[PDB]
C-alpha cells in the first residue's frame, strides 16, 4: 500500500531535541534502524528507541552529570551535583518521542522531566547565587550582573559546606535552626534559606564577628553559609524562590 510514503515520510523527519540548552538532530540512520512494520502498520522497535532515551538520560540527566560553570575568580569549574536537577522519565519520553517520529513531520522538543525545572533551557542561566568554598565568599547574580556580593564563613572541616548544584527550595523569616555537634544547638536566624536536603543553607550569622578567610577552620558553621546580618537581609529580601545556588 502506501504506507510506504508513510515509512518514507518518518525516514526524512527531522527530530531535533532541545535539552540543557544543547539542540542536536536524531541522526536518520537511527531512525531508519528503529522503523520497523508490524500488524499492517508502520511502527519503531520501541526497544530501540527506549534505548535512545535511555542514553539520553544518562547523558544529559542533570540529576546524575556534574554541572559546568563559570565561577567569578577561576572561570570554567565543575559542580557535583546536587538538588537542583532533572531527570528524563524514560518511559513517558520514549511513548511521546514514537508518536512525535511516527507523525513523519518535523519536530522539535525538549524531553518529560522529573525535577526542580524542566529541560528546555540550561540548568543554570545568568540568574543565581554563587558560594565560592575557596575564597569563602559569595556572589548573587540577577541577569548576568552582581547585585550583591560578601564574605561569607561555611562550615567548619568535620561538617563541612558539601559542593554541589543546588537551589533555594524555601525562604523563612525568624527560624530556627537545630542540630548537633553531641549536644544539640539552637541560634536563631532571621532568616533562612534551605538549598539542601540535609539541612545545610544561607543565613545571617549574627553570632559571627568577622567573616571570609580562614575563619571556617576555627569558627566554621555546622554546614551552612553563614552571612553577615545587614547583607542577609538584603539578599533574602532580592532572592526569589527557585534560584539556583552554587557551591564549589
Ligand atoms: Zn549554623
Redesign the pocket.
Known sequence: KEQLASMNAIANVKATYSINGETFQIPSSDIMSWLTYNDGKVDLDTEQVRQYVTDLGTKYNTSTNDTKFKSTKRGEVTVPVGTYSWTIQTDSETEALKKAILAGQDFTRSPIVQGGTTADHPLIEDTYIEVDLENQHMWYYKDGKVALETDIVSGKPTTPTPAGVFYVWNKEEDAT?KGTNGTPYE?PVNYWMPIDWTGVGI?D?DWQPEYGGDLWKTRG????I?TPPSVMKELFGMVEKGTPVLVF
Open positions: 535552626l541560634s543565613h550569622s558553621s555546622h554546614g551552612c553563614n
